[PDB]
């Protein structure tokens, strides 16, 4: 099974005579889909991996200045100039400073001074455009009627057997048909990149910390930047946003850098969506994928089965899930072959009357070996009740009081 | 010769990140270094059930900790009247062809 | 106030309430920091594996 050890679990029932069961999948959220005569499936959106993107803008948050130089002329002589003004790697500024008989000239007033310095970046961030064409959603399915993960030792395990398969959903390929096998085929025509992840979002990378940022919030980040084309010794634009030179007492201006800007922007995207995980593929931490479920060509596994006879015996203690459902795991201990597990909630013992709801539709034992275990889930009624599985002879009861 | 009053840390790096978690009904988690200073810890609950290895369902109990360490500090000193040493330059008129001094 | 190598003057009522880690005196080797949680954020959403 799957989808039992989570809180964000959403139960939905399928219309009798209808094959469309629309549902919403989200990161960290599970969905349990049930029908009247169709098997119960547990679907979950596991990963949203985006990859193979191109950079748009690259902002610098750690800049280092170098090569401080200046050239100045006295008031009446005119405006100052320095050769490094025409250089694309230098930031300059023209300001007025006191001049007169004291310094170097013969007239009092304000002379012109130009101060240039060689800009260079030490640490920068890169934002990329994630076009709808390249991102892969992953959805995991798990049908009820198995113990934990049989023969497949992991939980994801494999795609090679029934009850377990992964369906990759991506825009330009939204519809998908999951070949469960034996149980049939579960269709899902999901709705990718419209349920969420609109084109306002860029994939921002800074110091291995990744995020998704809005459309114009990334455009006007007040930092030096260069466009989406990378070459050696890049050309930085608006370097003055990180290199400030404002006036001193007089006679010269000082140029200082704005220090680092990593934590300054760390607090600037509070609440923004996060995509921390890496491995050459951005693994998102948020999802709101809308999907449509097609229950046309799936069928119950245990409909042509006869009821099991060699009564069960409990394996673990029946536990109450987070939403009130009951879960039990039992070892059948009889080589009846493939047979249908009789499961029922009984308020009394006179007649085993249906009192509540059964989550795992028609539990079935799997193999023909001697001892086999299986897990099923039930929906108890509010108040006192019992739990009985097996034929009347050698029944097993467990007192259960829910809410 | 001023003295420090309060020094802030604006660049820090953590290490020795460790966590401890127990399934529900097993009380609360605990770590050995959680009482040690220069550590940051937080106790919260996570979803736990049979799929994780357990006997019951519900919220577990886990505490995480990391060894705090500062990389760059900023220091705030006190300006006490013990050292202010103002210098006042004087220049009289009647001579001194050119310059300030 | 001195932070990297540049220095400023600061109103003490503003300096006393800077939300950052801090210690009182002049501990050189191994300081005992106060409010270490100012820089260590713990994202922990109910699923699993608080970061």
């Amino acid at each position, epitope marked *: 099974i799957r989808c039992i050890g989570v809180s964000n679990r959403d139960f939905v029932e399928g219309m009798s005579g209808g094959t469309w069961v629309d549902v919403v999948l989200e990161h960290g959220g599970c969905v349990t889909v049930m029908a009247q005569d169709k098997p119960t499936v547990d679907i979950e959106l596991v990963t949203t991996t985006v990859s193979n993107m191109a950079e748009v803008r690259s902002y610098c948050y750690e800049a280092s200045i170098s090569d401080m130089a200046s050239d100045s002329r006295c008031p009446t002589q005119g405006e100052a100039y320095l050769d490094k003004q025409s250089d694309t790697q230098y930031v300059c500024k023209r300001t007025l400073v006191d001049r007169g008989w004291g310094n170097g000239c013969g007239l009092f007033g304000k002379g012109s001074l130009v101060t240039c310095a060689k800009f260079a970046c030490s640490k920068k961030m890169t934002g990329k455009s994630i076009q709808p064409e390249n991102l892969e959603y992953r959805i995991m399915l798990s049908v009820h009627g198995s113990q934990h993960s049989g023969m497949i030792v*992991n939980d994801t395990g494999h795609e090679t057997d029934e009850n377990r398969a992964k369906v990759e959903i991506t825009p330009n390929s939204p519809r998908a048909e999951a070949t469960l096998g034996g149980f049939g085929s579960l269709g899902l025509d999901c709705e990718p990149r419209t349920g969420l992840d609109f084109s306002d979002l860029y994939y921002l990378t800074m110091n291995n910390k990744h995020w998704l940022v809005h459309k114009e919030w990334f455009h006007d980040i007040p930092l030096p930047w260069h466009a989406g084309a990378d070459t050696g010794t890049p050309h930085w634009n608006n370097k003055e946003a990180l290199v400030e030179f404002k006036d001193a007492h007089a006679k010269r201006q000082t140029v200082v850098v704005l220090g680092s800007q990593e934590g300054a922007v760390h607090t600037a995207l509070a609440g923004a969506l996060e995509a921390e995980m890496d491995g050459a593929k951005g693994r998102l931490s948020s999802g709101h994928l809308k999907c449509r479920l097609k229950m046309d060509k799936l069928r119950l596994k245990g409909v042509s089965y006869s009821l099991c006879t060699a009564a069960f015996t409990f394996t673990k203690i029946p536990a109450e899930t987070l939403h009130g459902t009951v879960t039990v795991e039992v070892q059948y201990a009889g080589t009846d072959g493939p047979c249908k597990v009789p499961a029922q909630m009984a308020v009394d013992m006179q007649t085993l009357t249906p009192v509540g709801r059964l989550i795992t539709a028609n539990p079935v034992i799997t193999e023909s070996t001697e001892n086999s275990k299986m897990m099923l889930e039930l929906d108890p009624p509010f108040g006192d009740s019992y739990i009985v599985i097996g034929v009347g002879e050698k029944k097993i009861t467990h007192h259960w009081h829910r809410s | 010769n001023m003295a420090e009053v309060r020094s802030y840390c604006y660049e820090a790096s953590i*290490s020795d990140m460790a966590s401890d978690s127990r399934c529900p009904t*097993q009380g609360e988690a605990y770590l050995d270094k959680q009482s040690d200073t220069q550590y940051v810890c937080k106790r919260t609950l996570v979803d*736990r059930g049979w799929g994780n*290895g357990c006997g019951l369902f519900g919220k577990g109990s886990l505490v995480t900790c990391a060894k705090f360490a500062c990389s760059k500090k900023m220091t705030g000193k006190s300006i006490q009247p013990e050292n202010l040493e103002y210098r006042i330059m004087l220049s009289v008129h009647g001579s001194q062809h050119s310059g300030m001094i | 106030l001195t932070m990297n190598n540049k220095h400023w003057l600061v109103h003490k009522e503003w300096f006393h309430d800077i939300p950052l880690p801090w210690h009182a005196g002049a501990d050189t080797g191994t300081p005992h920091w106060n409010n270490k949680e100012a820089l260590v954020e713990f994202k922990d959403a109910h699923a699993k594996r608080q970061t």
Partner: antibody
Amino acid sequence: VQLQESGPGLVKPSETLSLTCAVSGYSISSGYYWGWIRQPPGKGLEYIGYISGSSGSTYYNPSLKSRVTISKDTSKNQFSLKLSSVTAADTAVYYCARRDRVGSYPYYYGLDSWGQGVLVTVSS
Amino acid sequence: QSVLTQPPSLSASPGASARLPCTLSSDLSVGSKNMYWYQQKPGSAPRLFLYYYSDSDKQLGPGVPNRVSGSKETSSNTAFLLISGLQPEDEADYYCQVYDGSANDVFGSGTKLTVLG
């Protein structure tokens, strides 16, 4: 996550020993401390140390404190161990194993997935 | 200190319940220690066998059955590796493991369990 060990056949005493470990099925730098454990001829398991996947911090053994140095490189998805100034008693069967440090499931706080293992002697 | 200890050899007839203890050092409280058990076939790269902390906080190996149980006796702090359905393929070397205050791996000597015949 099936780790394969590769290393030289023999090293002379007091000579640098290097073992290379390819994980081959899981991306390093996601977490999951990677370590090295040995069993000299037939005795119990002795551990040497492990390196952090994401951060890269190295935690070693108190007895093997000044001789070993564990390296990591995620470009080709491998991590190695360097044993300097080996002794005759250091002949062992080494295994690079996996381990989780921050997870909420204590089963993975132990060495879940193991490597194949190499045998190395220190004879002449 | 902080060393685990347990006998070099144990054996039992196939079918009976074999209990493999693990006595921790005096500076440890086994009631709050996550016990880790490793199984090593003679030459095949020991695998994780059973982690046990409590009768409701336990997790076994990927394929080992429920015959393998764990328990703790907190009177004299000593974990247990219980194997109920002793088959001939349970003949292997078993280790136990805990962690110190600084989270350094502390392994045990382990018992070379032999299934008789």
